[PDB]
Amino acid sequence: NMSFVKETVDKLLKGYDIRLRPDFGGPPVCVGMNIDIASIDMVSEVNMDYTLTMYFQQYWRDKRLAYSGIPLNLTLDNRVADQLWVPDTYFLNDKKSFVHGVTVKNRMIRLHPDGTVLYGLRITTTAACMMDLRRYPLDEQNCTLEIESYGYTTDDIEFYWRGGDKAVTGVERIELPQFSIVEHRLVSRNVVFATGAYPRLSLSFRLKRNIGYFILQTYMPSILITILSWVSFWINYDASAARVALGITTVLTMTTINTHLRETLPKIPYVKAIDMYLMGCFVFVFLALLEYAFVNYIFFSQPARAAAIDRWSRIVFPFTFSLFNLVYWLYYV
Amino acid sequence: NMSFVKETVDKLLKGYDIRLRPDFGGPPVCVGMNIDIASIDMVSEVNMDYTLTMYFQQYWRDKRLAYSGIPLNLTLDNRVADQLWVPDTYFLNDKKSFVHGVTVKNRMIRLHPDGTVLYGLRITTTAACMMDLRRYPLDEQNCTLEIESYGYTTDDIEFYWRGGDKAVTGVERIELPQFSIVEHRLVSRNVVFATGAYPRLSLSFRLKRNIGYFILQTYMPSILITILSWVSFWINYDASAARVALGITTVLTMTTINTHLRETLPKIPYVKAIDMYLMGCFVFVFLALLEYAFVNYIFFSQPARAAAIDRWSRIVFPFTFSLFNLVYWLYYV
């Protein structure tokens, strides 16, 4: 009997004031939340943000919407949401969000007989995440989502995770190219501004960066160029054009590798781990070129000392480069 | 009782003309402003602007909204803001702005018994900022936000910072990788257009640019290439191919550094500090190449003079480069 359902729903919205919260003037209304993370699309060091798509569900009780005589959950057309009170929830650290609207607004309203309202949205949000790049690309980040009431203080509204630590689902299915999600955490607290105290829910993820792209992209080219620079020690010292060509080529390749590295990051003012490695490699290739300069300078009058310097450089440069690699990879792992 | 408050608000909005300002036809209405800065997302030299996110709070008194019998402040659902008069505040130097709208429009309305309205918005605005880059990257910028009334002249409306020097908070939340905030300033004045005189608030920040990134990525490569160009002085003058290769490589690499760096900025006509540094380094490397050219020209008939020239260049070039660096870094710091 749909006519009775229609009359009941018309009756529920008779004299209903959407300007007033449930239990207005009384104890705070409790809103429970849960989130299904559909995806985490892109994490950007350049923009210091990440994108996230989720099903966001809010739960509360409104006794003006209690009904009797219908033993069913009432799923209503989502436009009824424009005729009801809903919480004024927002994300503090977001930069641009939207509700999906194809084919219609991705919104859900479900009433229960006791007056309980389930309100669901599908949201894509870009959120700020300040990143510490001092150990990049061997770094680990902590990106959060902050959920707050905008207008209502803790005297009017309270937040809580519905189900405790089970309130956020779908994190374990997320696959990221550059990162892996070590852990996620749920926090509830209060935050005080000049206009009062507000409830706050926090959802945090810890992301660990994968190293393989950087092994293939920056570390191995640097190692190979540094090794290439050592071929000079095995060419006779009187071949000036050849050894100068080797030194120049290695220095140019070091600069090229560094520029391709820096073209993908924000302009932070401190030194990163990859920067440290690249300038170690640059010091090595520059020292090899200087070694040839010394040998070429002194070999006219002291051929034996020049031969000894070349012979010892055959051994010393690999040994010191191996030591530098050992120290670097032990200090950062 | 929710119905009593419901009828109180219904009485407040009964007979309310939204087309008229408070005290229309009488003394001007005073609007107090507060700004709580959440972040400055980015500062762009290419687009000559910056993006700011903030809580913008306006305070005024509308006697038509006074109510009695409820010793409480009514926090209303923000949709009621569509039924009230609000000031026509705009930002003169803004280029694109939006109010955040997830999950609802980030808007707040709070009424007080005597008729005071508190009206809050969460706004992200991209505001224009003309930058003088003559001292770049050692430059200091001043970026402002201009708050004005569009339609109402000073006879209708007045603006003031509510709280004086404490009207803007959250300046310590500004985390820019390439800048640091040195100072912020609040200004109140009037601006005369052909349609009358209008109140104007002004909020300005002084940005100091951090030099670390440019030291790491621009100055050091140039210094290292200039030093590499001096290795030619220590190589015997019979190695024409080796020394010519050294000089040519240094010259072309300096030109490449300058072009690549300048391509990433707006096409301003004047010379920046970094440009003057790069041009000095270019002069040094070009002079080293010219020195070898002269030595190669004269050494088959005057070998002693050529040897003396190389011997003196070894000492002279580092000394003059050190003097150039001392003068440059004293003038610009």
């Epitope: 300040m130 005080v192 | 310590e172």
Partner: nanobody, 105 residues
Framework: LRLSCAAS????????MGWFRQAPGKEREFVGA????????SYADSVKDRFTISRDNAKNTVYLEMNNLKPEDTAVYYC??????????????????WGQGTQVT
């Protein structure tokens, strides 16, 4: 007199250090706050031009120098860390990690 607050661990997640003092009969009172990186200080009215706050990231320290004392400056002093999205700068509730109390007469 000079109070030093040396912080270790995750100072990146808590980029702001603040100073508070508790009187025997009054609640905790905000004194000043310092940003670890930006070095942008903020002060309460009662200690403007008198107390100074400095930061050094070499060993992760923040210094409160107290000068021109008064008998109304006899309170147990605390240092605290504030999260990135923790709210207002003047409210003790928003600070998570609190240091040990220090007495001044």
């Amino acid at each position: 007199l000079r109070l030093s607050c040396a912080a270790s661990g995750h100072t990146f997640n808590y980029p702001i250090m603040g100073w508070f003092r508790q009187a025997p009969g009054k609640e905790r009172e905000f004194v000043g706050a310092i940003s670890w990186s930006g070095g942008s200080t903020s002060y309460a009215d009662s200690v403007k031009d008198r107390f100074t706050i400095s930061r050094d990231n070499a060993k992760n320290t923040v210094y409160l120098e107290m000068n021109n004392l008064k008998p109304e400056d006899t309170a147990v002093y605390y240092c605290a860390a504030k999260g990135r999205y923790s709210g207002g700068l003047y409210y003790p509730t928003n600070y998570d990690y609190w240091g040990q109390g220090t007495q001044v007469t």
